[PDB]
Structure formats: structure tokens, C-alpha cells
């Protein structure tokens, strides 16, 4: 019995070693691992016979549905299409923004003007919206 316990403990120790070299030393994008709220910093402390972890996490709330577009072009120029970087293009519901579209982060609702910092140029696609007048990011 003692031998069996020792072997399972060795395997368990390897798992702990792996989490210290991923879950603790750096942020991870895998999910599954660590706490279940995306991943943000985690900590570990000594415990009898083992290691004890604590994982800080992010929990979403109060979800709303909004209108969004796959990307934006230019009705005057089919090769001018853009797409958001790490975020989305949403129809505006905010009184500060005169523009019909706005940029948001995906972890939290928060509209902002679309700027070149939040976009990348992409090949055109038929599902992209075409702008009939003014789109400032790029203006041309």
C-alpha cells in the first residue's frame, strides 16, 4: 500500500510542478487550468504534505446584447477594409460619439471611437458594411 501511495504522490507532485511553471509564473490563455474566470495572477503557499494554490479570477456579469458588424469598408473604395483588433465593432448607443460605429474590448462593455490603434487592414469581404459617407480611421 505504501508503494502505491508513493507513486501517486509523485505524479501529483509533477502536476504541481507544471502549474507553478505556468499557472503561477505567467498569465495563461489556455483556460481549464487555474481558476475558472479567464486567468489573472495566482499564488501558492506551503501546506502540510503539499502545495496550496489560490487563483484570482474575473467573473462577467449583467450581459447585454448589441448589434455588431464583421468589419467595415468604404462604399467609394472596396480595398479600404478594416477590422477591429482584439475587440468588436458595435453600433453606437453613446451620446458622446457622433459616429455610427464604435470599438469595444471583449472582456467588458465599453464603447470608444474607432481609431487606427484599434484596427488592422484586411482583405475585403462581402459581409463587411460599406460606409456611405465618413469613416475617420483611416480617413482616406
Amino acid at each position: 500500500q505504501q508503494l502505491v501511495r508513493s507513486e501517486s504522490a509523485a505524479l501529483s507532485a509533477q502536476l504541481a510542478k507544471d502549474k507553478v511553471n505556468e499557472c503561477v509564473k505567467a498569465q495563461s490563455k489556455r483556460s481549464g487550468f487555474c481558476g475558472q474566470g479567464t486567468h489573472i495572477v495566482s499564488f501558492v503557499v506551503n501546506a502540510p504534505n503539499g502545495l496550496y494554490f489560490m487563483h484570482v479570477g474575473y467573473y462577467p456579469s449583467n450581459h447585454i446584447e448589441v448589434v455588431s458588424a464583421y468589419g467595415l469598408c468604404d462604399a467609394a473604395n472596396p480595398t479600404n477594409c478594416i477590422a477591429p483588433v482584439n475587440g468588436y465593432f458595435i453600433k453606437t448607443n453613446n451620446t458622446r460619439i457622433v459616429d455610427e460605429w464604435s470599438y469595444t474590448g471583449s472582456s467588458f462593455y465599453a464603447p470608444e471611437p474607432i481609431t487606427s490603434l484599434n484596427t488592422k487592414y484586411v482583405a475585403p469581404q462581402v459581409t463587411y458594411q460599406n460606409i456611405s459617407t465618413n469613416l475617420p480611421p483611416p480617413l482616406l
Epitope: 448589434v67 453606437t92 448607443n93 451620446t95 460619439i97 457622433v98 459617407t133 465618413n134 475617420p136
Partner: antibody
Framework: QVQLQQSGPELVRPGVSVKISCKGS????????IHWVKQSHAKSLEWIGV????????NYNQKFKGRATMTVDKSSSTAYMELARLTSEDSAIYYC???????????????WGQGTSVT | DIVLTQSPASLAVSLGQRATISCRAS??????????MNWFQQKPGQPPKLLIS???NQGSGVPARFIGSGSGTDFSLNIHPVEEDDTAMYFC?????????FGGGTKLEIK
Amino acid sequence: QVQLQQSGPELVRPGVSVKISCKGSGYTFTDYAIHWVKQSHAKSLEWIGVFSTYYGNTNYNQKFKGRATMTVDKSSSTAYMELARLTSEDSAIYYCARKSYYVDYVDAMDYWGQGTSVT
Amino acid sequence: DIVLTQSPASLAVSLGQRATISCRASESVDNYGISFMNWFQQKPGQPPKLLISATSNQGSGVPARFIGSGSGTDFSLNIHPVEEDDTAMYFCQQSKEVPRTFGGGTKLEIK
């Protein structure tokens, strides 16, 4: 308690630019865009332009692209607007208005200024 | 922006009479079913006032008597309790696209 105080009317001579103002009161001035419209007759009105009070972003009626502009003094909580190159055909009643969203994604003109005029 | 028109150019009614206003658009204005139609009220010597929005027949500064109606190119206003202080010019406005133009309007009057 939202208010706009539009500036008084003037009989400005042609070829002179004309400035209009409408300071905010009772709300945070920087959180809502200003809308500007023109009334040449009780049955004839048109949009002139919009100015974000937070980012300074604008759009204008294309007839006025070489004409009128809008500015804001955020420290004074006030909006200003001006029309280049006045002509006798431009005499009109003008109104400041505040942007709102009573319905999702629908621009509403909400509160209106008492009106001013130019001749 | 899409052109708006309205009819009859003026309407005269008895007190407490039901009444309506037609308001055609040159092109359908619905985008994702949003509609973007606003109605406004004005009297001489005064600024326009917001009345209703395409999904709001209550609130938006008015009593439930201002009933919005229609879809696509056709819209209307329906008021069952007209009173003398409801006599005003009325204006459809389209927020779907810039310039955000609006109709010349019609005017209600008590006989």
C-alpha cells in the same frame, strides 16, 4: 433641469461670419453631443451639424462643408458655432439641441434651446 | 438621407376627435428593424419638441395618446383624444442616415 442659453439674435450685414453660442446648465456638459439645425420657415428646417463635446468630433451638412463650423470651450461648459460668409438668403432661426437615446441606436434631439436668429 | 413627406398638409378637427397623420418615406428606413423614426411638435414662437420614437409610443416626453405606427416606407401618428393644446405643427424625422433630414410637416387645428 437641463438647459441651454442661446445667445440673442442679430441683424448681421452680409459677408460677415456669424457666431452663435449656447452654454449648458444642469447636466455634465461633456457627456452629450450638440446638434445644430436651421429654420428658414416654420415649414422648412434642416440639420446643420453635430459636435461631440467630449472628443471634439464633428460632422456637417455637406452644403455647409465650406461654410459653418462648431467649437467648444469645455472649461466654460459652452458651445459655439459659426457661419462663414453670410448672405441675405441665410437669414434664419437657429437651434442648439442635445443628443439622446430613448431607443437603442436611435438618435433623438431631446432638449431644445429657445432659438436665436440671424438677418 | 431618405426623403420624407407628410399628408394632409393641415388637418382640422372637432374637440376630442381622433386624428392621424400620414408620413411616407422615399425608401424604406428600417435597418436591422430599428426604423429610426422620430416625431416632433412645434408651435410658433417655440422650439420643436420630441414626441415619440418608432418603438416608444409612451415616454420620450409624452402621454400614451401619441401612438406611433407603420414600418418600411410608411409611418403614421394616431391620437384618439385631440385637444386644442395639441394643435401644433408636426414633423417626422429620420435618424437612419446623415444629413438626418426631416419632413416639412403638417399642422393640426381645432375647427
